[PDB]
Design a protein around this ligand. Structure first.
Ligand SMILES: CC(C)(COP(=O)(O)OP(=O)(O)OC[C@H]1O[C@@H](n2cnc3c(N)ncnc32)[C@H](O)[C@@H]1OP(=O)(O)O)[C@@H](O)C(=O)NCCC(=O)NCCS
Ligand SMILES: Cc1cn([C@H]2C[C@H](O)[C@@H](COP(=O)(O)OP(=O)(O)O[C@H]3O[C@H](C)[C@H](O)[C@H](NC(=O)C[C@@H](C)O)[C@H]3O)O2)c(=O)[nH]c1=O
Ligand SMILES: [Mg+2]
Length: 187
């Protein structure tokens, strides 16, 4: 598979071993990591994590991206599709992090591109993910875009996002993905 994921102000490309330092730094930023998993601050350890990740990628099992801002081609975060299953065909996503240098609407664009990748580039039917209780704005984001709060445990709320909702969102959210082919005008 090869991806061509770009929106208005951001673009995504697959993680390489050389992104290890950017990743270590991002994930060990205490302003960003309140609700994600602890991980190594050691660059070589992170390079190793990516090498294993690359085997999974080679076998169609996982796709992990650096998020870039288009205007200066500088890295602003991460996102991942992982843990694929069947009946129905489902993917998880997460590892979703944006730093201070993010564009304003990067969160919207990157989420949309995830769903482009999963539902159209990879042919899944459903998306699953979770968000820690307390990560209030992220709950609100996902509910707004159309995720369905299935359920929960002591830590998380568990969501699914159906392919059907992604197809509505392509029209409603077209302004985030590219320049419009025609604009609405009221007389
Ligand atoms: C999760 C994360 C990537 C979200 O990015 P964010 O920039 O904080 O997301 P926001 O919800 O602020 O969305 C960005 C902007 O688009 C707007 N927006 C969000 N959803 C929208 C929608 N459906 N329609 C239109 N606008 C929308 C927001 O209001 C915000 O604009 P504002 O500047 O006017 O507030 C980021 O907060 C982060 O890295 N957090 C730490 C790591 C983490 O917890 N990851 C998630 C684990 S569950
Ligand atoms: C991606 C990555 C992970 N790790 C380590 C950290 C863990 O010990 C292990 C597995 O990581 P996880 O699967 O928990 O990845 P993580 O990026 O922390 O994110 C996941 O766990 C978090 C606690 C969050 O729940 C996260 N959820 C989301 O981001 C969902 C979005 C849609 O809001 C979810 O994807 O691997 C690394 O050491 N380096 C890495 O680059
Ligand atoms: Mg490409």
């Amino acid at each position: 598979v090869n991806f061509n994921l770009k929106a208005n102000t951001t673009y995504l490309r697959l993680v390489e071993e050389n992104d290890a330092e950017f990743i270590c730094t991002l994930r060990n930023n205490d302003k960003l990591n309140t609700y994600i998993s602890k991980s190594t601050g050691d660059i070589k350890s992170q390079a190793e994590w990516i090498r294993n990740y690359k085997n999974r990628e080679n076998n169609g099992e996982e796709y992990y991206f650096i998020i870039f801002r288009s205007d200066d081609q500088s890295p602003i975060g991460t996102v991942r599709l992982y843990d694929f299953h069947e009946n129905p065909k489902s993917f998880c996503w997460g590892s979703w992090i944006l730093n201070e240098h993010k564009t304003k609407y990067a969160a919207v664009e990157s989420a949309l591109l995830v769903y482009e990748a999963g539902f159209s580039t990879l042919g899944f039917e459903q998306s699953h993910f979770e968000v820690m209780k307390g990560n209030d704005k992220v709950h609100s984001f996902h509910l707004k875009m159309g995720a369905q709060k299935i359920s929960e445990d002591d830590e998380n709320i568990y969501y699914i996002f159906p392919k059907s909702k992604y197809k509505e969102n392509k029209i409603q959210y077209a302004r985030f993905l590219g320049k419009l082919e025609h604009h609405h005008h009221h007389h």
